[PDB]
Amino acid sequence: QISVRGLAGVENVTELKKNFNRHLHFTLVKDRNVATPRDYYFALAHTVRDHLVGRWIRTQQHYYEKDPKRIYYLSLEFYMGRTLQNTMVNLALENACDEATYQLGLDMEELEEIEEDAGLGNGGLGRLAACFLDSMATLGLAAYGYGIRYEFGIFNQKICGGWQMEEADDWLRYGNPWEKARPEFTLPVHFYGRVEHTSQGAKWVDTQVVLAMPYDTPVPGYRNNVVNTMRLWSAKAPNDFNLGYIQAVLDRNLAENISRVLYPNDNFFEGKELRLKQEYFVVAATLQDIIRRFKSSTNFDAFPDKVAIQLNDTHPSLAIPELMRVLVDLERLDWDKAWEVTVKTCAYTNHTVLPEALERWPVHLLETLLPRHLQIIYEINQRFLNRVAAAFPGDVDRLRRMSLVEEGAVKRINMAHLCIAGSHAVNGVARIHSEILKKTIFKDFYELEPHKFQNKTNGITPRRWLVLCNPGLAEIIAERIGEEYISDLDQLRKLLSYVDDEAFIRDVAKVKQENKLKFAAYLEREYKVHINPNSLFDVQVKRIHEYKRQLLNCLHVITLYNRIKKEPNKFVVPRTVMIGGKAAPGYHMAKMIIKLITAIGDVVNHDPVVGDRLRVIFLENYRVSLAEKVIPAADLSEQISTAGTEASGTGNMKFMLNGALTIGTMDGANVEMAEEAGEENFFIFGMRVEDVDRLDQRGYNAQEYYDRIPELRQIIEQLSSGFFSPKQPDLFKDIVNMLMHHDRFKVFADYEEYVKCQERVSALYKNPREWTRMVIRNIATSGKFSSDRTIAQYAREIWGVEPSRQRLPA
Amino acid sequence: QISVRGLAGVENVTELKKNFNRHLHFTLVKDRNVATPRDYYFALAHTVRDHLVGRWIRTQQHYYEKDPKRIYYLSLEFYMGRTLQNTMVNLALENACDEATYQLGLDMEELEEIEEDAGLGNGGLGRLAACFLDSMATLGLAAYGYGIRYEFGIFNQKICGGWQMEEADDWLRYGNPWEKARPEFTLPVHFYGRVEHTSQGAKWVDTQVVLAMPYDTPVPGYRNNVVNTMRLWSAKAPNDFNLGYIQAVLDRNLAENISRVLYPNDNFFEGKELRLKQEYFVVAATLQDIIRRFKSSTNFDAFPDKVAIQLNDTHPSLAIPELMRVLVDLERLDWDKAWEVTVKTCAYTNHTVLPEALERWPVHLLETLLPRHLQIIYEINQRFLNRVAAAFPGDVDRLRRMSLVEEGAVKRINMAHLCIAGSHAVNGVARIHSEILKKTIFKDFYELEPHKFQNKTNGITPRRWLVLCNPGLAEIIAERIGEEYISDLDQLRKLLSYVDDEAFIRDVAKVKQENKLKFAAYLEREYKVHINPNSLFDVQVKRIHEYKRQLLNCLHVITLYNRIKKEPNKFVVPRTVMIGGKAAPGYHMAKMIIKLITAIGDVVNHDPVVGDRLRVIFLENYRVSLAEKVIPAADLSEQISTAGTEASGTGNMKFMLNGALTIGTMDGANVEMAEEAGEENFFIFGMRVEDVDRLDQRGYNAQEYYDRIPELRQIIEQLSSGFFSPKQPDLFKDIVNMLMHHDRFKVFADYEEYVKCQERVSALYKNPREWTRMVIRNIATSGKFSSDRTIAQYAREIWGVEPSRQRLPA
Ligand SMILES: Cc1ccc(-c2nnc([C@@H]3O[C@H](CO)[C@@H](O)[C@H](O)[C@H]3O)[nH]2)cc1
Numbered sequence A, B: 001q002i003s004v005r006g007l008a009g010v011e012n013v014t015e016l017k018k019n020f021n022r023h024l025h026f027t028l029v030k031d032r033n034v035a036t037p038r039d040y041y042f043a044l045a046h047t048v049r050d051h052l053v054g055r056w057i058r059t060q061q062h063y064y065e066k067d068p069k070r071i072y073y074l075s076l077e078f079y080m081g082r083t084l085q086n087t088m089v090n091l092a093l094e095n096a097c098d099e100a101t102y103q104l105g106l107d108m109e110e111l112e113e114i115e116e117d118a119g120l121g122n123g124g125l126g127r128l129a130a131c132f133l134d135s136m137a138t139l140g141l142a143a144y145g146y147g148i149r150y151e152f153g154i155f156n157q158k159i160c161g162g163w164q165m166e167e168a169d170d171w172l173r174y175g176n177p178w179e180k181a182r183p184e185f186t187l188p189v190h191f192y193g194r195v196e197h198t199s200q201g202a203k204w205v206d207t208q209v210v211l212a213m214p215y216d217t218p219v220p221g222y223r224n225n226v227v228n229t230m231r232l233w234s235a236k237a238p239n240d241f242n243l244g245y246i247q248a249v250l251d252r253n254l255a256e257n258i259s260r261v262l263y264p265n266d267n268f269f270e271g272k273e274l275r276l277k278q279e280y281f282v283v284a285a286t287l288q289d290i291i292r293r294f295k296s297s298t299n300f301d302a303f304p305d306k307v308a309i310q311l312n313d314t315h316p317s318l319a320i321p322e323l324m325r326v327l328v329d330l331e332r333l334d335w336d337k338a339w340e341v342t343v344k345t346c347a348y349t350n351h352t353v354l355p356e357a358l359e360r361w362p363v364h365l366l367e368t369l370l371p372r373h374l375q376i377i378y379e380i381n382q383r384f385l386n387r388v389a390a391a392f393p394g395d396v397d398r399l400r401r402m403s404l405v406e407e408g409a410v411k412r413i414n415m416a417h418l419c420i421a422g423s424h425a426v427n428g429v430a431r432i433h434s435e436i437l438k439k440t441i442f443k444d445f446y447e448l449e450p451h452k453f454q455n456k457t458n459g460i461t462p463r464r465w466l467v468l469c470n471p472g473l474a475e476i477i478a479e480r481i482g483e484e485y486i487s488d489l490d491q492l493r494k495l496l497s498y499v500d501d502e503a504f505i506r507d508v509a510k511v512k513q514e515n516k517l518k519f520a521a522y523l524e525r526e527y528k529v530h531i532n533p534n535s536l537f538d539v540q541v542k543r544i545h546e547y548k549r550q551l552l553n554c555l556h557v558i559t560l561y562n563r564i565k566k567e568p569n570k571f572v573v574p575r576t577v578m579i580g581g582k583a584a585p586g587y588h589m590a591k592m593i594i595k596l597i598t599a600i601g602d603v604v605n606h607d608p609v610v611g612d613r614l615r616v617i618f619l620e621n622y623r624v625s626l627a628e629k630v631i632p633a634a635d636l637s638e639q640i641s642t643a644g645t646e647a648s649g650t651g652n653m654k655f656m657l658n659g660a661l662t663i664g665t666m667d668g669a670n671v672e673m674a675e676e677a678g679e680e681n682f683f684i685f686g687m688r689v690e691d692v693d694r695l696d697q698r699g700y701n702a703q704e705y706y707d708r709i710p711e712l713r714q715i716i717e718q719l720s721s722g723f724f725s726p727k728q729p730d731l732f733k734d735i736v737n738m739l740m741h742h743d744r745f746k747v748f749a750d751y752e753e754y755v756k757c758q759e760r761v762s763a764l765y766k767n768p769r770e771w772t773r774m775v776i777r778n779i780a781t782s783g784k785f786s787s788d789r790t791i792a793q794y795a796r797e798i799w800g801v802e803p804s805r806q807r808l809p810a
């Protein structure tokens, strides 16, 4: 069909067809007369999986022989989404499979919709790890992703009566064909116990043992025959566990609960024991695997030459004292030498400055669960603070501020401080964020060790986020500039020479229009909702949080509604406003925001005077597979966090690559996106970080904005009075109270500038040709935001390895 | 190599080799350089499994087209053991696989030892169900075995300091290649709730739902291309289960615990709620499956013509009121018509008369868990007792005795009475047992409905229990009489014409000798124990219970030891006494018996005066795979239960087929074995059932035997005084106290006759030729004890279907 999807050679199509029939018979144990679409999906998945196997074995053999430096990316979250299409894309099998399935009387697109997302993450941090794995494989790095195989990933969201309800995501119910259990490489992990001091060192004894069983998932690079591994650990009880008899066997669940469920908080710290166990479990199993592989190449001097460990935020921070434990207590290295090895091996990436997100563990939890680790952390702290004292003599407040141990009501360990002390590099995830780290939260550490601090601006993989989800756009681009841009996204700059080309302008607009029709159709089929495909598709999809300011969007929507009601017969550019995202189950304000959005829709969508000039839709169960559908369909990307709060953002980048214009604040990577595209090609509004600081210094008073802006006052009066909740007039009181008296994110402060900027958006949308030309300028300058660029920078500047675009032999 | 193992054709061997290599690469994702024996086992298992698939699909298609009467065998236990060799035997692939693996440089016998037993049973009842499945497939019956897929089967037994310790049997750790999950056929099962009475019938509402997910295992018949199904249900929570958030997901274990673990009691009733849930779970899921299949052929008149349900003891007895519930409450049949259908569909097999084994459920448990079922049971009881009253007017004690409801401190439902009332046939499992049922425990029911009561003497499958475990014996038999006896065991009678053939006599003795050498070698390798292969191998393997009288064996062993110590320089026939079996974890006396056996061994095995004339070995972790090793090696089979207590026995039959002579009481099937072989060819001793009754009538006084038998007094004094436990002199006080004052099984009463009979055994063993001739007379008359004979009788006399030995097309 289309060029970028690869060849459909007769030999290949014939072989795919016979292997499909083989799997259906021998693997699935079905005949064609009772097979369902799900059986057909599994037969295709097994057929494609067979093509990974040789490449996977050969890749891992190659690393064993060549013994390159290995990169270990430790994360509690890997938000992978679906695997079938991605695998076909990376192996150049998409057109062949399309042809094979077509000849068997099947629609491959229909079979793709059957696959469950692997939802082992909350949002941006989890999805970054997934893009990173794809880029590391594409760049030929000997890289391993290590995490937890949660039985239940991020919950499925249902909306009932306008409220979020949660259902367990039983993603493994039908089996996962992509993973391979490796019970033979099961490893013990220790908990509780006590420390004994002998003649020759400390000993951690009387521990409870939990087994870590690995499951391996292949990670194919783009057309280079490299297949790397993601290893996810599952918790198992030992067979003598608790060993009346029946109860002892039933109580195995206590141990196995460690890997049962993903904590569903985004940018929030919940200090529960089960979470700490998850964090140690992944670290302790992973480090034994790392050391085993290193010894199977005694002299730990060379450890940092053969191993890099990248900590995805502080969640795997226990890697630092665990590595020290192993080197000191088990390998009998002296402390100073062990510490040198540890620092040179470990690197830390920070993803947030929100105080409520930072991990600060109560000492009493660590004392009980991980008594030897607490001792090591204390020793690290004392040696570190001795260095601070020598560098800044007499500065006793600096000593208190920089300590790993926080004093107070309850004593806590600051895990970010631990990571900085024990890592040779510390990075933020966008230039403004990395600057914020050095100026504010980590200022003291930057002054002590300036060389540690780096920036690595985030990116997204153009395989999943262009070729897979938007083949139409990929195709019209390839027609002009060839296919090389898929693994070298900077080549999109060549498209600037087509900004005045009438044919290209038409094709870009046509692709968007087709994406919008397809999405409007998806809406009707799967959710019985009617939308106008000629309206401007105004989209804010991301987790629900106060800092992301879905509420500011809500205020604009009500403003548009009120302006229509005021002048019904005046023309306005029609909009479909789509907002989606999950709220953490315990986050009350986030749950109220969802209810407000559906409540606004109930009024707006049924007002006859509005007609189809304004629709407000809440997109249910936002997840990676839904992102792949809605992002190609969007016209306007809402990236409206308070300046200084969104560390980078990555949805922003996905929208830019897929032909939406952006309305946003100068926050996170939005700053760098506007710099790349030109500020004239971006809808920038609102306070900058410096303006937020100024307001905080004199004191934010929301009442002032209410008093001076009549359109804003009207909205608050509607909310308070029950306009959007007739049967429960006080339903939104908590929201109004927050906005008026304790809004940490200054929603009212950016309201006027936001509304004005939205008017400029609508004015440009009325001129299709100039809108499309601005889109082309965005797509053309999106190259910097490839995760291939990001990973090349980590490789060269942190890990000390050179990427390679060279193919392994098939 | 040997004839009965089938052909090793060049084409077949070539194809097996390439499929082995394919699975190793594509299925296991290994290369030969890092593969272990376990990987090789799995590659072979997948290769053999592929050969089942076509036959399985075609068999099930055939039943759909022909629509024969279907047989549903419901059991809480299926003790399957290993599957690889059995599958090769039944498909005629053993020699070909042996050759294929040999050419790849592998020893197939070594790979077979890697497979885990599927231990989903306790002992004889569970293993009967497994033999029955094999026979039903071999006889071409459209039969389905339905049970529970326990995550943990019967515990692994370790002996530590002479005591039993239990370890969980994590049999699924490495995967089960033989099962196929069928998540698409998941069905709901209801618990708790309450009954609502409407205008049109009762309604069971406000229930908790647990899902039943089926896993299907193929059951191949012997060389007939029939592959039937065993469907085992696994418990899953619904996705809105309990749906703060984290705890709700963790609490899914409450529902999933239903299928977690097999209750490890043999011939004992433990009235716990979890057990009742297991019993209802299997019944409720199974019956929906049965009805679905029946409707996919409205008129339930024909239900009993298309369906037979066989209840394996009372464990699945809730099938009776569940079928009534479905027909009355959901299909809206009138009561009388529903009852007619139910009675004609259901049949009940009793396996025990021990009072402590009979299921009598507290009414309060049923009231809470299964309130509609309790109502139906009450209604059944009232209608039944109205019939009893009409047949036996004025006999009010009969009404109390026959009631399904037992009055007392706690009200209970007698499940055996429920099964008799609701079944058209009731059978025992050996002639003497079936007579006991009619004379004692079920006398009142026999008087009301004599036509219901039948006998079906148990049997064992000669595939597993001769061809698989004793290929040497199978081969020398086949040389004389051909191969047809493997599916028509009565042909072994032809061997009587060889009882004076010197060549056959020599070959039978040689095969036994080779089996003994191989077992003696296994002992040394896996357990570091030294045994003399020229000694008489005296074996008692079976679950540990008072009624099986391992204690009587112990008394004989100590008698032999004491006689040697008394006259050290007198010749005695050397013996190796082997006792093995598991004790239920809560059964204190059974645990003490194990300790006594190991304690006797500690003394006897280390006395220099004894030398190698007497060894006592406790065989650890007795299970199906160990039975397959020890039974072919035995010379003497100990079948010494108190007359009237062992309903049938099936180990007895296994020993007879494999060339051991039997020392036993006239109990269970021992009676019929002696009748078949001739009493002169059996070592019969002890009280008959009538003698036990006589003793009970005048009162069993153990002191009398102690006073009159000096050899017995000496043993009791040794036990009491600490001879067998020097550091803990009173260790065996509970055992001595039981023997002297409350022995329900009359160990002392049979002691003298037992010792005398053992002397006759030893005298015959001194004459190898006559010993072997008696063995040939046993093997030759073992045909009746094929489970093919048993199943043909169930088919004709209970289920109303004709067996077929005709092959389906390959
Ligand atoms: C439990 C927990 C889960 C997630 C997080 C978390 N902290 N920052 C993020 C997000 O990380 C993305 C990738 O760099 C960023 O693009 C985004 O700006 C962050 O808010 N997530 C923090 C705690």
Ligand SMILES: Cc1ccc(-c2nnc([C@@H]3O[C@H](CO)[C@@H](O)[C@H](O)[C@H]3O)[nH]2)cc1
Pocket (backbone or CB within 6 Å): B122, B124, B125, B128, B265, B266, B267, B268, B269, B313, B351, B352, B357, B429, B458, B646, B647, B648, B649, B650, B668
């Ligand atoms: C929980 C439970 C488990 C097993 C039993 C049970 N009742 N009889 C048996 C045994 O069933 C075999 C097969 O017919 C018989 O050969 C044997 O004689 C019985 O003791 N097991 C009873 C309860």
Ligand SMILES: *Cc1c(COP(=O)(O)O)cnc(C)c1O
Pocket (backbone or CB within 6 Å): A122, A123, A124, A127, A541, A542, A543, A622, A623, A624, A627, A648, A649, A650, A651, A652, A654
């Ligand atoms: C990219 C992505 C995110 C991150 O979106 P932001 O707007 O950067 O918060 C979250 N969830 C999903 C499913 C994504 O694909």
Ligand SMILES: *Cc1c(COP(=O)(O)O)cnc(C)c1O
Pocket (backbone or CB within 6 Å): B122, B123, B124, B127, B541, B542, B543, B622, B623, B624, B627, B648, B649, B650, B651, B652, B654
């Ligand atoms: C046959 C068998 C039994 C039954 O033995 P009995 O002597 O009849 O009690 C028990 N366990 C196993 C493993 C068996 O193979």
